[PDB]
Symmetry: D2
Subunit: 255 residues, 4 copies
């Protein structure tokens, strides 16, 4: 197994990409803590056995859950910070303080708090480099409409990732971001089925479809394995060509 004997924590582990990451990590031989909200963990089944469920809430709760997790693993080699709120609010003109605060607090500050706690535990455990992997978005670089808080926080996560890579290189830790495009988490191909939205996926994604969580999780394996030892401060974009293309609606097969 490519991750044989490594200790990993995956946050947002009841969500689409987080769940798929837990499963891929278990198949590749890692010992894995799956962290998410207690009720969400309660309602998840993993396709692979061995996951250690640990409830958490994206500051005291994060430190508690992380200490708990590291205690149970006896170390920490890989952290995947996948806890995240994804959603739009409306136009910027009408964006409330409460929606701004929730996205910034949960996506940005939550990622900061998890990663600091994890980096500290990796150094305490003797960090072969340890690995921190952040889940950003194509929205870390280009903005969707009517989601300014989510978008801003994703830019914050992208730069937080680069800053961490710079500061933790001396401590034996590599840090990188995965930037997914549209991903269908429903499990029954009903994500992106609204007609206007489906048309726009066909126009804007060169592969003409949303991704599956498993197509994202594979990058999480790649960035955690021993062979990725010169990769840090970088982004792996997994978006079917979305960020590579302009005027995709004009292409042969679409127009």
């Amino acid at each position: 197994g490519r991750l044989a004997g490594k200790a990993a924590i995956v946050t947002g582990a009841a969500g689409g990409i987080g769940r798929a990451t837990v499963e891929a990590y278990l198949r590749e031989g890692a010992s894995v803590v799956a962290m998410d909200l207690a009720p969400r963990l309660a309602a998840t089944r993993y396709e692979e056995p061995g996951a250690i469920p640990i409830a958490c809430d994206l500051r005291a709760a994060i430190d508690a859950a992380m200490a708990d997790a590291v205690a149970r693993l006896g170390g920490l080699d890989i952290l995947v910070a996948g806890g995240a709120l994804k959603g739009g609010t409306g136009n910027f003109l009408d964006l409330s303080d409460a929606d701004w605060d929730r996205y910034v607090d949960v996506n940005m500050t939550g990622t900061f708090l998890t990663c600091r706690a994890g980096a500290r535990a990796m150094v305490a455990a003797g960090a072969r480099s340890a690995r921190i992997i952040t889940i950003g978005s194509v929205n870390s670089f280009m903005a969707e409409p009517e989601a300014a808080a989510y978008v801003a926080a994703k830019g914050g996560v992208a730069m937080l990732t680069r800053a961490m890579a710079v500061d933790l290189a001396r401590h034996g830790i590599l840090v990188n971001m995965i930037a997914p495009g549209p991903v269908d988490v429903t499990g029954n191909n009903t994500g992106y089925s609204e007609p206007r939205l489906a048309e726009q996926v066909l126009d804007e994604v060169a592969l003409g479809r949303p991704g599956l969580p498993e197509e994202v999780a594979t990058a999480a394996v790649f960035l955690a394995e021993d062979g990725s030892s010169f990769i840090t401060g970088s982004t792996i974009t997994i978006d079917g060509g979305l960020s590579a293309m302009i005027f995709g609606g004009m292409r042969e097969g679409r127009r």
Copy 2:
């Protein structure tokens, strides 16, 4: 004058780039509110006359100052959001919750609150497009060492800028970021004079020196004037070639 008769608010107006922006705006014919901390405004002189000083503190204070400012101008055509904390903390491993919160609250949330208030006033005043200009940094794209909170917040400002451009285009407002590199604000050539730091500026900046605030303010004029009517969601980088170059220390004249 290129800005003749336009109403402008400049935040961070007692700081280097903000002060230089107030002056350039006044010379190009604008009516200008200069906003900053009361004690800092108290201790500033502008080289050009006509600035309307309005004290503020980077939420209730921002809304009060902005209403006050728009009342005094009788409209709002241009906002420059330059209020910002610039500084490093230490290594990411040791970054406290308090330093994280201060940079994120002041640089990111402060910019959000100022821009929402300003966009709302521009629409109420009948937004030729109105203009919002944000002051980010090269640190919005690449990380300096030991400044993870500042760096993260600058990434958040960059993406906030793009999200605003997308959402406010329908409301007649263009939104862009200025990304300065090293800028000497001291006024007496003593910024970047520490020997190791001076050597690194020579290596990393193709022009081999820090910029002056006035070399940044000129972009703020350009992005506010009528001719810039197709420019939105973009960044103007003003860094002497810093972000364009790698292994600059190996170039002819340096090695």
Copy 3:
């Protein structure tokens, strides 16, 4: 006084939309301007502003001759705008011929290289460094690909990186180098660019401002990058695309869906 008062400028592709608008803006801001393009195209252009010095050229011996000719007539060289460019699509990459590849790479990339090297050499001979200024015209296609135009797209990437490389090497010689990256620009003069129905719909979806730009909206950046106040700007790109490169899923936005 005029923001460019008393500066000598060469504008290539000067009979084309953006080049023509650049000549005009430069003349209005007080520059002495050589307009370079193909002889027959210069023959068929009128400038809205007087004072342009026409010099025929063909985007290697032709370029060196025209550039020496141009510098001779201006008595110096302070600003070069390299706007000569072929813009067009070919078809799918699978079917792209050697001849179309060679034409776009030779004209857009090698032509820009040859013009800029000759210009930089003349700026140094004339005593650059106030810095001399080289401005290249790239495209949003320097960074993101349109369909069925792989040769044009590749060459635009080459121009973007040539620009950065020139900025690094010519900083010591007193020359600043930057790129302008336009999105869709209507050069027709009668609002018929981007009128094809499917294309019009896609401009509404992908450009936040919901329309193509005008050449004059690009030329303004050429003034900005050539003036004395832009003295710390080099190796950078000014993007002028109505929010095209900033936005994804623009067709879903309020007012469009």
Copy 4:
């Protein structure tokens, strides 16, 4: 094996990264054609057995070699376009037509001719998606001094890659670039040993060293395997943090 039963062509296969790619591909179960100059192939030994040597010269020679290669494999699933001239010339002012032409012809046009031939053979063979992997550089995005031709051609390769991704998505082919930073190909740690250069590697690369060819080859495996099915038009950067960091010489441990 992650590439079990796939047919691959690797160009520049006697060079550092190309050699390491051939070896990784053979270990992961692929049938591999190694293409390079005849004399260079003559003087290479692969650490893994099974490589099919095919001499070529980076237009008629490329078409001949490619047809030859596809004939011997009985198909084509993966192309790695690694043939490339790497070198600096001097200052831009003094760059000759001959050096410009050589870098543009070999790096850019050579990559174009190889990839068109390969894409055509992949479609003829019934392209699970086929995979084209280009080897660019950090110089595809940021310029090193005194190498303008090399740099320009690397920017051309980057955009050629994105254009191919857009056009070939409908034909079942995913296209991505690997962007290495400094890589020691010498085999005896003498790459980057010149004192001034060694000091600049320490400053500019967060990991503080050059990479090894094997640290690049691992990305070529990742981008060729079935699980990477939603990745196209993207770049994997493998540079020890070089492109992520500014003022790296000022970091703790360096200053």
